[PDB]
Design a protein around this ligand. Structure first.
Ligand SMILES: NC(=S)Nc1ccccc1
Ligand SMILES: NC(=S)Nc1ccccc1
Ligand SMILES: NC(=S)Nc1ccccc1
Ligand SMILES: O=C(O)CNC(=O)C(=O)O
Ligand code: NI
Ligand SMILES: [Zn+2]
Length: 331
């Protein structure tokens, strides 16, 4: 078995290897990359996402989210308070202000220490889930707006034609902005490109050990657990690497820098934070190996978790028994 310790693997494809997206994902998995839950892909030196980022300041963040924490430094939840709209130029200025800017630090490890010590005492503002893309239409390789769709994958594998679309989302971050412990909708893959700015640090639990994280989460957030059998779908819970180690949860960590791709694999729980002002683009995708994970994916039916239009068909076809109750998530 490849990669039995479930290490995060880093790949350096050649420009020739960067042509066929599906083929390279399959290659990564042949080397055991999926066992970690997360992989890094460094693009060929000849590749670029677009020419420059000089003209992005007029993009609108219609609903910036202030991430307010509750709990203790290593075990907390966050809720998202809606703020007034602002442009990316305005957001960048805010990120760089004295109130919100990255503190002086020695290295990534020093900044990580500062994050877990002090995160809960601040409320950074995030521009998340903004439909759009910053890939040039002429970028032919690993263009996240030009991937094969999940709906076409399901049709190719299972022969059923379904409604729905999937398109990329942009994320504008600042120091301490946080993504909570989660797997993707329907335990899909995700791919994330860091277009510009400061790094993003990731934590990940191997898919074969996901239930260990779930059990700890139930212990650490007992009221939330009683409210919903899949409350990590709410994407609001944080657990520090120190607390994971104290409880024997297997995990790994890695820092993503501008110009690098990360791929998360089916049922790979992940969480993380941004180092400073940055912009990332991400989208979900599927492969034939995903189908069995989609069939088994937990669902939130308490009504808290966000439901995309396109997830309906996934639940309807892959989980027909759960569909009525999940669809009771409704409204
Ligand atoms: N072990 C790492 S980090 N990467 C890698 C990628 C391809 C082939 C062999 C090794
Ligand atoms: N062709 C589609 S829809 N997706 C996909 C992605 C990676 C590998 C194989 C297939
Ligand atoms: N290196 C880190 S992240 N250490 C740490 C220890 C205790 C509390 C918070 C962080
Ligand atoms: O970048 C973020 O804030 C969160 N991204 C992801 O969870 C992802 O790409 O799967
Ligand atoms: Ni994710
Ligand atoms: Zn729920």
């Amino acid at each position: 078995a490849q990669n039995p310790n479930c290490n995060i693997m880093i790949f350096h494809p050649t420009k020739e290897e960067f042509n066929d997206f599906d083929k390279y994902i399959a290659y990564m998995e042949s080397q055991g990359a999926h066992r970690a839950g997360l992989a890094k892909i460094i693009p060929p030196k000849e590749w670029k996402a677009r020419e420059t980022y000089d003209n992005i300041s007029e993009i609108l963040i219609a609903t910036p989210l202030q991430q307010v924490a509750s709990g203790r430094a290593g075990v907390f939840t966050q809720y998202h308070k809606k703020k007034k709209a602002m442009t990316v130029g305005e957001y960048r200025h805010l990120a760089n202000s004295k109130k919100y800017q990255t503190p002086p630090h020695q290295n990534f490890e020093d900044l990580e220490r500062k994050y877990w010590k002090n995160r809960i005492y601040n409320s950074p503002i995030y521009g998340a889930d903004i439909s759009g893309s910053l890939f040039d239409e002429n970028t032919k390789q690993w263009n996240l707006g030009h991937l094969g769709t999940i709906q076409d994958l399901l049709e190719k594998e299972c022969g059923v034609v379904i409604e729905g679309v999937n398109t990329p989302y942009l994320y504008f971050g600042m120091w301490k902005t946080t993504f909570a412990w989660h797997t993707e909708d329907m335990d899909l893959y995700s791919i994330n490109y860091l277009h510009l700015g400061e790094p993003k640090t990731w934590y990940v639990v191997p898919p074969e050990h996901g239930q260990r994280l779930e059990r700890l989460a139930r212990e650490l957030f007992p009221g939330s657990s009683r409210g919903c059998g899949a409350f990590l779908r709410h994407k609001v819970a944080l657990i520090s690497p120190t607390v994971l180690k104290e409880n024997g949860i297997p995990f790994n960590r890695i820092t993503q820098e501008a110009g690098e791709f990360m791929v998360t694999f089916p049922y790979g729980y992940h969480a993380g934070f941004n180092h400073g002002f940055n912009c990332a683009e991400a989208i979900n995708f599927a492969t034939p190996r995903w189908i069995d994970y989609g069939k088994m994916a937990s669902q939130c039916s308490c009504g808290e978790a966000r439901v995309t239009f396109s997830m309906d068909a996934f639940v309807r076809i892959l989980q027909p028994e759960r569909y009525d109750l999940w669809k009771r998530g409704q409204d």
